[PDB]
Amino acid sequence: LPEGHPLKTLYQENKEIMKDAEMLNLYAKTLATTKDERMREEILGVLEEIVSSLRMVGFTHYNREEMLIFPYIERRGLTVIATVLWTKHDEIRAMIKQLAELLRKREEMPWEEFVEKFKAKAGEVAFALSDMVFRENNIFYPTLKALLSEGEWKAIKMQEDEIGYYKVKPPEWDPGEDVKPLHPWEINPELNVEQLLTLPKEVQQALRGQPLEFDKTQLKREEDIDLGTGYLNIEELKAIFEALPVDVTFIDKDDRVRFFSPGERIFTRTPSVLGRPVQLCHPPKSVYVVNKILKAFKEGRKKEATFWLRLREKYVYIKYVPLFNEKGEYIGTLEMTMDIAPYKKIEGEKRLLDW
Amino acid sequence: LPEGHPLKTLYQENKEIMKDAEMLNLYAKTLATTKDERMREEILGVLEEIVSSLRMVGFTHYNREEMLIFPYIERRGLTVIATVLWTKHDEIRAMIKQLAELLRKREEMPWEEFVEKFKAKAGEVAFALSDMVFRENNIFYPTLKALLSEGEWKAIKMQEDEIGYYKVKPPEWDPGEDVKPLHPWEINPELNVEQLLTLPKEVQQALRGQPLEFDKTQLKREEDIDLGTGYLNIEELKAIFEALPVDVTFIDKDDRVRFFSPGERIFTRTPSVLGRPVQLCHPPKSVYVVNKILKAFKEGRKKEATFWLRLREKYVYIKYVPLFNEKGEYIGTLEMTMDIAPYKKIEGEKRLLDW
């Protein structure tokens, strides 16, 4: 594997996780046998760095695997691998968090109680991290290596920086300017019998006696609009805009009303307003404000205008922003209106349901 | 004109405004000459009804004219008529409001001061309302009558109920099942010289010496998507979704992620997630909640699920709702995420700028 290959990077990260898991163990055991106060504060300082570093495993390494890689094997009938790895990743994340809390609350308890709990907990984290590196290196990665095409690895390589890396700064990798990058919906997910039989034993065992089922669902449908980050049809777009907590009105480059969101709105709009200069939409007394906002937007002196007021039981929050396209060119202005009184009365936390 | 014709309705409304303006005058003058306390409270009771009724002129009659009708004459080069009528409508709205306030605060001042201010102010409101009815009936409406086609009146008739009427309950009107309804961007705005010369004198005078300029701007552009309430292209749709204060993720009918909003989001999403079962997107421990929400949405036992939490300096508010199409059929589920901490700290009112 060349430097930069997403698979090489995963191996490289694992080598760093192994070192950190092992230094964690070394330092936790050592802390438990150390009497000198100063030497204790030194070991604790290293332990804080190691543990704080290990928290990054979930946000980078595990996260890239779960978000970038699993989709390609799920389509190939290997969802169980993904589900089982994901569940383990979470158990390790939870254990690293417990370890950080212990280290943080160490002066709330006698020293003998702290060092013994820290040593036990560190031993468990190190063992789980190590066992995951081994499962990954020896079972999961040889699977990916046999199954994924260059074009899938290229698609993957492209999204990696959005998430990040555990202690690796990988260089560039492109397998070829004529290799087309493949998203999970673009591959042939099918595996033949020989591929099935060459799967590691542990992966075949995970199937629990059930032949592979491939996912050939098509993302792009007949009437779909390619929005860059998804595919939607007219009916979906309509229902989405209605469902939003903002009422929206789009003013295009001629300063003409071009679109308003459907459904119940705070300030009603009619069809007869489409194509109308925004200045003819307002009382003549409001026009100076409308024009001074649009000019500041166009010339780039301002990037927002905000108003708000009470309107019966509604706390109406109004915001105007200029819209720009990819090249950085002004394409119009968006008016956004919402009732913010419902949020004003949100307190504490809700992380569960009620049904 | 047949009953139901939007022009007939405007005349009918004006006849009601004239009566109310005249009863206002009658009762204000009478109040000023009445000594008996009981007779005073009776006149005041009628005055409250009349004034409270007159407040509706702006929200219905004037509002329909401004929103439904003006666009058709603006395109024909008669923007000045629209601007001048609109400015007057607002002066009358402001005067009716002053009259209502006077009536409301009547016991804050001596009676002789109140009745004399009420009589003066009522006289002014009645005169302005009457003068507007006369301008409209004699100048504006004969203009509309000569210029607007059946198809424009049909388009107009269709939107009238969205706004309402001043004391008229018009029946149905369709000029013919083969008459195509015309929006302001669909007409020929051009006027010929004879039409110009047949314009009322007052309308020609409003032109201040300048030949008509017609608006032939086209709403529907080459690559436009017809969204029912406007026309947008891909680039506009992208910039709009990014500009919104909600992060959005659309789950389609297969329970597959189909779209997520671009730009900086609170919870990052990657391309590799498109087409993915929503259940494979989440840790396996979160799946029971995901499925119980989707089922309650599909079966119609629930129409929303809401969560919220602190995430550093952000107060993240998360809401799931099921989306339905026109016929009432489930088309998927929308996840909406926003930082509501910025609104939590909004107080009092902002109705002006700062630049």
User: CB of A29 within 8 A of CB of A119?
Assistant: yes
Residues 6+ apart with CB under 8 A from A103: A44, A47, A48, A51, A118
Residues 74-93 of B with CB under 8 A from A: 74, 79, 82-83, 86-87, 90
**By what method was this entry solved?**
X-ray
- Considering just the CA atoms, what is the radius of gyration of chain B in Å? 28
CA distances from A136 to A17, A85, A129, A304, A337 (A): 12, 9, 10, 49, 50
d(CA B52, CA B99): 10
H or E element at residue B350: none
Quick check: helix, strand or coil at residue A277?
Answer: strand
Residues 6+ apart with CB under 8 A from A121: A95, A98, A99, A102
d(CA A154, CA A8): 13
Q: What is the DSSP string of A215-274?
A: ----SS-TT-EE-SSBEE-HHHHHHHHHHSSSEEEEE-TTSBEEEE--SS-SS---GGGT
User: CB of A341 within 8 A of CB of A312?
Assistant: no
d(CA B154, CA B186): 13
Helices A150-159 and A6-32, interaxial angle, to 10°?
Answer: 60
Nearest to B119 by CA among B57, B49, B43: B43
Q: Which two tokens stand for residue A31?
A: 């802390």
CB burial of residue A281 (10 Å; 0-12, 13-18, 19+): buried
Q: Which two tokens stand for residue A350?
A: 């809700």
Task: Report DSSP state, residue B267.
Answer: S
Helix, strand, coil percentages (3-state) for chain B, rounded to 5, are 55, 15, 35
Of A183, A185, A349, the CB nearest to B308: A349
User: CB of A250 within 8 A of CB of A332?
Assistant: yes
Q: What is the DSSP string of B119-144?
A: HHHHHHHHHHHHHHHHHIIIIIHHHH
Residues 6+ apart with CB under 8 A from A284: B83, B86, B87
- Looking at the DSSP assignment, which residues form a beta bridge with residue B248? B336
Nearest to A280 by CA among B140, B79, B65: B79
Question: Could you tell me the residue ranges of all domains in chain A?
Answer: 1-217, 218-355
- Looking at the DSSP assignment, which residues form a beta bridge with residue B338? B317
Q: Which two tokens stand for residue B97?
A: 């409001």
Residues of B whose CB is below 8 A from A293: 353
End-to-end CA distance of chain A: 51
Interchain pair B302, A355: CB under 8 A: yes
Mutate to test the interface with A, among B60, B67, B75, B270 (most CBs of A within 10 A): B270
Nearest to B132 by CA among B182, B103, B166, B177: B166
End-to-end CA distance of chain B: 51
User: CB of B290 within 8 A of CB of B251?
Assistant: no
Task: Report DSSP state, residue B69.
Answer: I
Torsion angle of the four alpha carbons A108, A111, A117, A118, in this order, in degrees rounded to the nearest 10: 90
What resolution in angstroms does the PDB record give? Answer: 2.4
Same fold, A1-217 and A218-355: no
Interchain pair B270, A159: CB under 8 A: yes
Residues of B whose CB is below 8 A from A289: 353
d(CA A66, CA A85): 9
Task: Report DSSP state, residue A66.
Answer: I
∠ CA A202-A203-A208, nearest 5°, is 95
User: CB of A330 within 8 A of CB of A253?
Assistant: yes
Residues of A whose CB is below 8 A from B276: 71, 74, 184
∠ CA B158-B159-B161, nearest 5°, is 100
- Looking at the DSSP assignment, which residues form a beta bridge with residue B334? B250, B321
d(CA B239, CA A173): 31
Alpha helices in B1-110 (DSSP H): 6-32, 37-54, 56-57, 63-64, 70-74, 79-104
* Sign of the CA dihedral with A47 first, then A48, A51, and A53 last: negative
Strands A330-339 and A247-251: antiparallel
Largest CA distance in chain B: 83
d(CA B133, CA B13): 9
Mutate to test the interface with A, among B78, B215, B223, B229 (most CBs of A within 10 A): B229
CB burial of residue B130 (10 Å; 0-12, 13-18, 19+): middle
Q: Give yes or no for A329 touching B (CB within 8 A).
A: no
d(CA B207, CA B201): 10
Distance of CA B24 to the CA centre of its chain: 28
d(CA A298, CA A301): 8
Helix, strand, coil percentages (3-state) for chain A, rounded to 5, are 55, 15, 35
d(CA B237, CA B224): 11
User: CB of A13 within 8 A of CB of A136?
Assistant: no
Residues 149-168 of B with CB under 8 A from A: 155-156, 159, 162-163
Q: Token match 């409308």: residue?
A: A290
Of A219, A302, A310, the CB nearest to B355: A302
Task: Report DSSP state, residue A137.
Answer: I
Interchain pair B346, A239: CB under 8 A: no
Q: Give yes or no for A312 touching B (CB within 8 A).
A: no
Interchain pair B343, A346: CB under 8 A: no
H or E element at residue A93: helix A79-104
Strands B247-251 and B330-339: antiparallel
Residues of A whose CB is below 8 A from B273: 67, 71
Chains A, B: CB contacts under 8 A, how many?
Answer: 274
User: CB of B243 within 8 A of CB of A321?
Assistant: yes
Taking the CA of residue A30 and the nearest CA in chain B, the distance in Å comes to 35
d(CA A209, CA B191): 80
Q: Token match 């700062």: residue?
A: B354
Q: Which two tokens stand for residue A88?
A: 């383990």
Q: Give yes or no for A276 touching B (CB within 8 A).
A: yes
Helices A79-104 and A111-135, interaxial angle, to 10°?
Answer: 160
For chain A, the residue count is 355
Fold assignment, A1-217: Four Helix Bundle (Hemerythrin (Met), subunit A) (1.20.120)
Q: Give yes or no for B330 touching A (CB within 8 A).
A: no
User: CB of B46 within 8 A of CB of B54?
Assistant: no
The CATH code of the domain at B218-355 is 3.30.450.20
